[PDB]
Structure formats: structure tokens, C-alpha cells
Ligand binder design. Structure first.
Ligand code: G1I
Length: 281
């Protein structure tokens, strides 16, 4: 009396992610005024989110509902690799956008020289290749395999699908994918807030006779609340085995998936971009 219910919610999640990614991609592609050096990063992020929504979510949904993975083992390895790739690519694109905003605000005179049309494609390709090398190489080549009896029993079984890793690989993946971008974003947005406060004081210095907090708070809080608990649990269950069950792990992982859905809504809100929506519909 509960299978017919959660399926509807998961289908709505899939539809929302697909629609949110596709609308942004087509709006940027087919409209002349929208093209900008800063909009290419948004295009890369939208592509990563679309790949996530198209590939990762439905297969995991089917696996959760029917409780039996009705495909091979090569397919499950590929699915895990694609999931890791998409997650790390999304996070690194976020940190790249934050760094670009810092460069734009802190140094306005030299902003043109630092970033150009040629230098953005190279950065995007570098981000994508480092994201790909972190996931496919250690997974597709069986270098992350564990040494537990339950782990080998699960690995030998064809139908059963589950995730087991050694502690070292979990630590390395978490460090590469989450912590460093978070530190970079924190420093960037602290500096941006300081600059905004300084300008706000400077204006009221002469023009005699808030919003920055709202914007920075929403931008940081959405990402931090969506993704922070999952990586803490990721470290914890491999440092100590008894603490974390297999259901809390899945729930906290699935919490982070919805972040890709909200990202186009929070990042793309420019008035010209809404005008671009207006023409489409
Ligand atoms: C299938 N779930 C995976 C399992 C581990 C993992 C994820 C995402 C990023 C990482 O760096 C990881 O190590 C999760 O999406």
C-alpha cells in the first residue's frame, strides 16, 4: 500500500530535473543576447545536471522499488562511475563559478585580461577531465574493491547491487570532491561580502539626507544543507563500521540529488533571462 505512492514522487523528481535542465540549455543555445563568457559555466553545469537526471536517478529508483537489480554487473559499475562523475563535475563547476565572481568583483580593471573566450573552454575541459579521471579510473579498473567477506559475497553475486569501498578511497574521493571547493567558496564569498559592505558604507558617506546577506545566505545555504551531511556520513561509516546503517546512507545520498534540480532556479534569474523565457512560452 506504499509502492504506488513513492513512484509518483520519484517520477515528479525526474521530470522536474529534466525540464529545469533542458529549458536553460535551449534558452542559452537559441537566443543571441544570452551568450556570455560567464554563461558557459552555467551551460556546463546544466549539461552535468541533465546527464544526472537522465541516467542516474531512474535506474536507482527502479533498484530501490523492485529491490533486485535486473541487469548485469558491468552495468552497475558503469552506473556508479557515471554517478560519481556527474556529482564531482557539478560541485567543481559551482566552485569555478564562485571563483569567476570573485575575479569579477575584486579586480574590475583586469577582469577582461584574466578571462576571455579562449580561456573559458580550457578551464571547462580541465574541470571535466579531472572529474572523469577521479571516477572512471578507480572504479572501472577494480581498485576500490574492499576486502570484507560480505563485500566479496556481494561482488560475486550477480543480482545483488551494493557499494563498498576501502577507507582510503572514501577519504580521497571526499577530499577531492567536496572539502576543497567548500573552502574556496567560503573564502570567496566572505571577501565579496566585505566588498559589498565597504561600498554600502561609502555610499552613505556622501548621499546623506541586507540584500547582500539574503543573496549570499541563500546561495551558500542551499548547497551546504543539500550536500554537507552526506559526506560526513561518507567519512564516518568507513572510519567506523557499526555506526551507520544502509538506509540512512541511501536517504542522505538521495537528499543530495535534488540539489541539481534547484540549481537552475537559484542561479538563473536574470531579467533578460526571464525575458528569454517569455519568448519561448
Ligand atoms: C552511488 N552513490 C555514490 C557513492 C559514493 C560517492 C558518491 C558521490 C561522490 C563521491 O565522491 C562518492 O564517493 C555517491 O553518489
Amino acid at each position: 500500500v506504499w509502492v504506488v505512492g513513492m513512484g509518483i514522487v520519484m517520477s515528479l523528481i525526474v521530470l522536474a530535473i529534466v525540464f529545469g535542465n533542458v529549458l536553460v540549455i535551449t534558452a542559452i543555445a537559441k537566443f543571441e543576447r544570452l551568450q556570455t563568457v560567464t554563461n558557459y559555466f552555467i551551460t556546463s553545469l546544466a549539461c552535468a545536471d541533465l546527464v544526472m537526471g537522465l541516467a542516474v536517478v531512474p535506474f536507482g529508483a527502479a533498484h530501490i522499488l523492485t529491490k533486485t537489480w535486473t541487469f548485469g554487473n558491468f552495468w552497475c559499475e558503469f552506473w556508479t562511475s557515471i554517478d560519481v562523475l556527474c556529482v564531482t563535475a557539478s560541485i567543481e563547476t559551482l566552485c569555478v563559478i564562485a571563483v569567476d565572481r570573485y575575479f569579477a568583483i575584486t579586480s574590475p580593471f583586469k577582469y577582461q585580461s584574466l578571462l576571455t573566450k579562449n580561456k573559458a573552454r580550457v578551464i571547462i575541459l580541465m574541470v571535466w577531465i579531472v572529474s572523469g579521471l577521479t571516477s572512471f579510473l578507480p572504479i572501472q579498473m577494480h581498485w576500490y574493491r574492499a576486502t570484507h567477506q560480505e563485500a566479496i559475497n556481494c561482488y560475486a553475486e550477480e543480482t545483488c547491487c551494493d557499494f563498498f569501498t576501502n577507507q582510503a578511497y572514501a577519504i580521497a574521493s571526499s577530499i577531492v570532491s567536496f572539502y576543497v571547493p567548500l573552502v574556496i567558496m567560503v573564502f570567496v564569498y566572505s571577501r565579496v561580502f566585505q566588498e559589498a559592505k565597504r561600498q554600502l558604507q561609502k555610499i552613505d558617506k556622501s548621499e546623506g539626507r541586507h540584500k547582500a546577506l539574503k543573496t549570499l545566505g541563500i546561495i551558500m545555504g542551499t548547497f551546504t544543507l543539500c550536500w554537507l551531511p552526506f559526506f560526513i556520513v561518507n567519512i564516518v561509516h568507513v572510519i567506523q563500521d557499526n555506526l551507520i546503517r544502509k538506509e540512512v546512507y541511501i536517504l542522505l545520498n538521495w537528499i543530495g540529488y535534488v540539489n541539481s534540480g534547484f540549481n537552475p532556479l537559484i542561479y538563473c534569474r536574470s531579467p533578460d533571462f526571464r525575458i528569454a523565457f517569455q519568448e519561448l512560452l
